[PDB]
Design a protein around this ligand. Structure first.
Ligand SMILES: *[C@@H]1O[C@H](CO)[C@@H](O[C@@H]2O[C@H](CO)[C@@H](O[C@@H]3O[C@H](CO[C@H]4O[C@H](CO)[C@@H](O)[C@H](O)[C@@H]4O)[C@@H](O)[C@H](O[C@H]4O[C@H](CO)[C@@H](O)[C@H](O)[C@@H]4O)[C@@H]3O)[C@H](O)[C@H]2NC(C)=O)[C@H](O)[C@H]1NC(C)=O
Ligand SMILES: *[C@@H]1O[C@H](CO)[C@@H](O[C@@H]2O[C@H](CO)[C@@H](O[C@@H]3O[C@H](CO)[C@@H](O)[C@H](O)[C@@H]3O)[C@H](O)[C@H]2NC(C)=O)[C@H](O)[C@H]1NC(C)=O
Ligand SMILES: CC(=O)N[C@H]1[C@@H](OP(=O)(O)OP(=O)(O)OC[C@H]2O[C@@H](n3ccc(=O)[nH]c3=O)[C@H](O)[C@@H]2O)O[C@H](CO)[C@@H](O)[C@@H]1O
Ligand SMILES: CC(=O)N[C@H]1[C@@H](OP(=O)(O)OP(=O)(O)OC[C@H]2O[C@@H](n3ccc(=O)[nH]c3=O)[C@H](O)[C@@H]2O)O[C@H](CO)[C@@H](O)[C@@H]1O
Ligand SMILES: *[C@@H]1O[C@H](CO[C@@H]2O[C@@H](C)[C@@H](O)[C@@H](O)[C@@H]2O)[C@@H](O[C@@H]2O[C@H](CO)[C@@H](O)[C@H](O)[C@H]2NC(C)=O)[C@H](O)[C@H]1NC(C)=O
Ligand SMILES: *[C@@H]1O[C@H](CO[C@@H]2O[C@@H](C)[C@@H](O)[C@@H](O)[C@@H]2O)[C@@H](O[C@@H]2O[C@H](CO)[C@@H](O)[C@H](O)[C@H]2NC(C)=O)[C@H](O)[C@H]1NC(C)=O
Ligand SMILES: *[C@@H]1O[C@H](CO[C@@H]2O[C@@H](C)[C@@H](O)[C@@H](O)[C@@H]2O)[C@@H](O)[C@H](O)[C@H]1NC(C)=O
Ligand SMILES: *[C@@H]1O[C@H](CO)[C@@H](O)[C@H](O)[C@H]1NC(C)=O
Ligand SMILES: *[C@@H]1O[C@H](CO)[C@@H](O)[C@H](O)[C@H]1NC(C)=O
Ligand SMILES: *[C@@H]1O[C@H](CO)[C@@H](O)[C@H](O)[C@H]1NC(C)=O
Ligand SMILES: *[C@@H]1O[C@H](CO)[C@@H](O)[C@H](O)[C@H]1NC(C)=O
Ligand SMILES: [Ca+2]
Ligand SMILES: [Ca+2]
Ligand SMILES: [Mg+2]
Ligand SMILES: [Mg+2]
Ligand SMILES: [Mg+2]
Ligand SMILES: [Mg+2]
Lengths: 439, 428
């Protein structure tokens, strides 16, 4: 049915890969339980040699998974990157979710245990089995309306880039980018889910290998870290492809004969000269070709078909002749310059709802009611709460109420409420499984 | 395999129809051959019994031949090509190729008394009736072609609907503009680009059921008329103007996030923010509650229909029936979301359209086509404004052919198997 249907066109050839969005698409999370005693002691020793808001969990991951089930049902697999911690409610019997530890993705184990989200984020593209294009969600980011892959990518325009107006980390990265790509004024990607291409990310990190190693080596956040989204999206937007002159030729050689006719030459002429095209512009190009055929070796200039030229001195204008004629290829490189290696589409921030949650209750109710009234595709409720403040518990309740109003149905990734995982850490679970199944 | 791949997701359900562009997509051309001596005689007689319909209306300058070559090169995903004519067939058309067919005016016109016709607007009122035509099809005038690779997303996306290519700005439009202003309210409108037009057959019929008199009148004009429903202008402004009323039942379902059929206090609050300006006052919430309470006592028990535990013990189970038939609530919902667009659409610029009016000054035509040579465009229209009696008209036709051959020199699957002094003056 569908195999035949996609070949049912004048070309008799399938274009499904261009007519359909790229699949599969996995999701990657990072999650941490700040209440874990092993973490608190290990963090304590490190500092002895980062407030509770960085590691605190308001059940954000639980409800974000509910939002995927409701608003992104097309996701293939969900990877939850942790330091070894396991959420008590996570249903590990569901093959659609798995836990990935820092040990599994970090390259230098000396960087662990870590407590720096930038360091972790340098390695999440290394997850074995990860789809080439995946979407990274912070645990406190979730979907507020139905989303589809074209909210992140299209074949015609590439990845969407959601930029916003603005950090010492940006100065450091801006300096790197200025030196690599020249200067540009750079806005900041929104606090939202980010689609990442594993190959582009690796190409980026191969460009700045020492910097990403440095960022990974920082066990706490640091001013000279490679900002995950900022680094990726500006590498994607700034990577340059060098003009392929042989491909310029094949475009002009519309009968695929290997030789440029007079009418094909005119098109080349119009593309290295300002319009209107003068007779001097045209004859100059012709003279360049004739001078080049004489000067160049006959081996490089290389009759299946017979081309007749207005100028009886014009030799067969072959690809070889054009490739190695510097006067022409210079004007070509001058007339077309700086081709982006990747396509991308700048987006506004209309579909992002980013809220800094503090402890002023009246204000928090107002922020969440704005999302109730005005649904948004991308929601980020960032923790800036002060728990010592008396109104802290009230705020936490208002948040739970908002979350429950949007996503009241438990997901296939939640254990039943009466059950919980026996072990809080992956190493303990690995040991129990081996003891049980032992002979 | 691929079948297995589209269910490989957390829902275990296939979303192929949303993840893939809509297919199939056919192409429709109209074509006329003005050199046909029977056509010439008939047109002359029609004019006399009644200028504005010169040879430029009907002259084949090889446009169709080269446009078909541009489909083979730039739109290989098209399923079928229908060529609509008055019975004429290009001598070179390979009808043994099942990917192309000829459709006559007789096959699609409703009133046969309107034929024979010589009016493109009249013909265009019926091309959506082609038997077997894909629901979404792309209509090309013969003098329109593709100049770069195009894909269906150049015309339509699931997320944003049909693309509408508008240009800063005729008597025909004044007539349609008045009709639209009366139907939808007054607005100043821009004109769609001269380009291939994607048309949805169901929306076209809905449009023609909204102005049945005017489309029958357009169909009945055997030559172009000041009071024609201009094809693209009528279609795209109907698409952008049709309004739909909000479906309260669907609002309720979005609010009822646990799908329990009853609105909890938590879900009611969301409803309250949607019909009120923030910040939300206690009075806003209580008044909404009182409307439901007032509505429950008043509505028939048959309409009102784990039990819900409400803050106010007086609250009834807020069922869909209670909300839908509560006039004070439904009217306040409609006041808060009024005149929703019935169709999705995306406004586009004219960066990808190259529209050239071809006259009889050879050097100026060369300049116009050089701009396309240098600056490729997805959509090209070379419009006939040639004085075909002029001596230089033959030279201009040769300039066009030379330009056409520089872009598409390869005969297409739709063509049947099988100057220097003019070059000097045009170019040297
Ligand atoms: C738009 O409309 C116009 C007008 O209706 C069409 O013009 C006709 O085009 C056809 C071609 O399809 C013409 O027919 C051809 O004429 C050529 C010249 O004929 C003269 O010389 C021959 C002797 O060689 C005499 O017999 C003849 O009477 C003329 O004095 C012929 O050389 C062609 O012959 C070839 O085609 C035939 C038919 O298939 C073969 O059998 C032959 O073996 C040979 O291969 C052919 O006869 C016709 O004269 C034109 N009519 C008019 C009134 O001008 C356009 O074709 C049409 N455009 C499109 C795109 O369809
Ligand atoms: C985040 O980490 C905290 C701390 O590890 C988790 O809370 C802890 O949950 C465990 C359950 O395995 C509690 O241990 C249990 O205690 C009871 C009573 O003492 C005992 O009967 C059990 O045998 C078991 O030892 C532990 O007390 C509790 N600690 C705190 C501070 O609450 C929490 O569940 C983690 N969150 C997530 C989402 O995983
Ligand atoms: C949406 C967004 O743009 N978020 C960015 C923001 O996060 P932000 O500054 O909001 O910091 P968060 O507290 O949300 O932590 C970032 C992410 O890292 C996870 N985490 C954090 C600490 C830890 O030890 N383990 C762990 O897994 C958190 O669960 C969260 O998923 O600034 C960080 C610093 O540049 C970036 O890394 C985050 O990408
Ligand atoms: C690209 C575009 O927006 N074109 C519009 C423009 O075209 P325009 O004014 O340029 O009209 P054209 O002369 O190109 O004719 C339009 C189409 O009708 C065909 N034709 C014409 C006469 C005839 O007797 N038989 C026949 O089949 C021509 O082949 C051509 O395919 O204004 C016309 C008048 O509103 C509209 O109808 C055309 O849709
Ligand atoms: C893997 O990392 C170790 C450790 O690097 C140091 O410790 C990190 C936590 C962080 O603070 C880094 O900036 C540190 O450099 C590397 O071994 C270190 O190598 C440097 C340079 O030779 C030396 O000065 C340190 O003393 C070394 N530290 C230790 C503990 O050996 C090691 O080279 C890294 N592996 C690779 C392949 O590069
Ligand atoms: C189909 O059309 C005929 C007549 O169309 C006429 O010719 C066209 C070219 C154009 O000039 C039209 O304006 C003409 O009307 C309809 O028959 C006409 O009906 C009206 C009112 O019933 C009458 O005033 C005319 O004299 C009639 N003309 C003729 C020639 O019969 C006919 O009703 C149409 N068919 C349908 C189903 O509506
Ligand atoms: C709710 O109803 C209150 C009472 O209205 C009076 O009594 C009821 C039983 C009906 O018969 C009605 O026609 C009478 O006028 C009103 O005072 C109150 O304003 C109403 N509130 C809302 C929000 O509708
Ligand atoms: C340039 O394109 C040709 C195809 O026309 C390809 O064979 C060649 O490898 C390309 N060169 C580079 C450097 O990419
Ligand atoms: C909460 O924030 C609003 C807006 O900034 C302010 O007017 C109000 O006084 C604040 N309330 C408290 C208790 O801080
Ligand atoms: C309103 O929505 C319901 C489903 O929620 C649907 O069954 C019904 O047909 C819709 N009504 C109209 C008039 O579209
Ligand atoms: C064509 O137009 C140019 C103006 O650009 C003019 O100089 C020239 O004389 C015109 N040629 C004819 C034949 O009218
Ligand atoms: Ca060639
Ligand atoms: Ca409910
Ligand atoms: Mg947090
Ligand atoms: Mg955060
Ligand atoms: Mg024409
Ligand atoms: Mg035209």
């Amino acid at each position: 049915v569908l195999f035949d249907s996609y070949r049912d066109n004048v070309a008799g050839k399938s274009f499904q890969t261009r007519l359909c969005l790229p699949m599969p698409i996995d999701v990657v999370y990072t999650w941490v339980n700040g209440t874990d005693p092993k973490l608190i002691k290990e963090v304590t020793e490190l500092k002895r040699s980062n407030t509770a808001s960085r590691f605190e969990d308001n059940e954000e991951l639980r409800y974000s998974l509910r939002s995927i089930e409701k608003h992104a049902p097309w996701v293939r697999h969900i990877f939850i990157v942790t330091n070894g911690q396991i959420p008590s409610w996570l249903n590990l019997d569901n093959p659609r979710v798995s836990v990935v530890t820092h040990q599994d993705i970090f390259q230098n184990q000396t960087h662990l245990p870590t407590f720096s989200s930038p360091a972790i984020e340098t390695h999440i593209h290394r997850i074995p089995g990860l789809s080439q294009k995946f979407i990274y969600l912070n645990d406190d980011v979730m979907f507020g309306k139905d989303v589809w892959p074209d909210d992140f990518y299209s074949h015609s325009k590439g990845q969407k880039v959601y930029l916003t107006w603005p950090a010492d980390s940006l100065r450091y990265v801006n300096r790197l980018l200025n030196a690599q790509f020249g200067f540009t004024s750079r806005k900041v990607p929104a606090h939202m889910p980010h689609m990442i291409d594993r190959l582009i990310m690796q190409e980026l990190q191969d460009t700045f290998p020492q910097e990403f190693d440095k960022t990974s080596s920082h066990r706490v956040r640091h001013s000279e870290d490679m900002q995950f989204a900022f680094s990726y999206f500006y590498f994607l937007m700034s990577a340059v492809q060098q003009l392929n002159i042989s491909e310029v030729f094949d475009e002009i050689d519309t009968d695929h004969s290997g030789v440029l006719s007079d009418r094909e030459i005119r098109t080349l002429a119009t593309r290295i000269h300002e319009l209107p095209l003068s007779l001097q512009d045209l004859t100059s190009l012709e003279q360049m070709l004739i001078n080049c055929s004489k000067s160049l070796p006959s081996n490089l200039t290389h009759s299946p078909t017979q081309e007749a030229y207005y100028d009886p001195s014009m030799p067969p204008v072959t690809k070889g002749l054009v490739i190695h004629c510097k006067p022409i290829t210079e004007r070509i490189h001058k007339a077309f310059k700086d081709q982006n290696k990747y396509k991308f589409e700048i987006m506004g921030e209309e579909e992002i709802a980013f809220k800094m949650i503090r402890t002023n209750v009246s204000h928090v109710v107002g922020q969440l009611d704005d999302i109730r009234k005005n649904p948004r595709k991308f929601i980020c409720l960032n923790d800036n709460i002060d728990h010592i403040h008396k109104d802290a518990g009230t705020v936490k309740a208002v948040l739970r109420d908002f979350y429950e109003s949007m996503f009241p149905l438990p997901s296939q990734f939640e254990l039943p409420r009466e059950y919980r995982n026996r072990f809080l850490h992956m190493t303990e679970l690995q040991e129990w499984r081996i003891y049980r199944d032992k002979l």
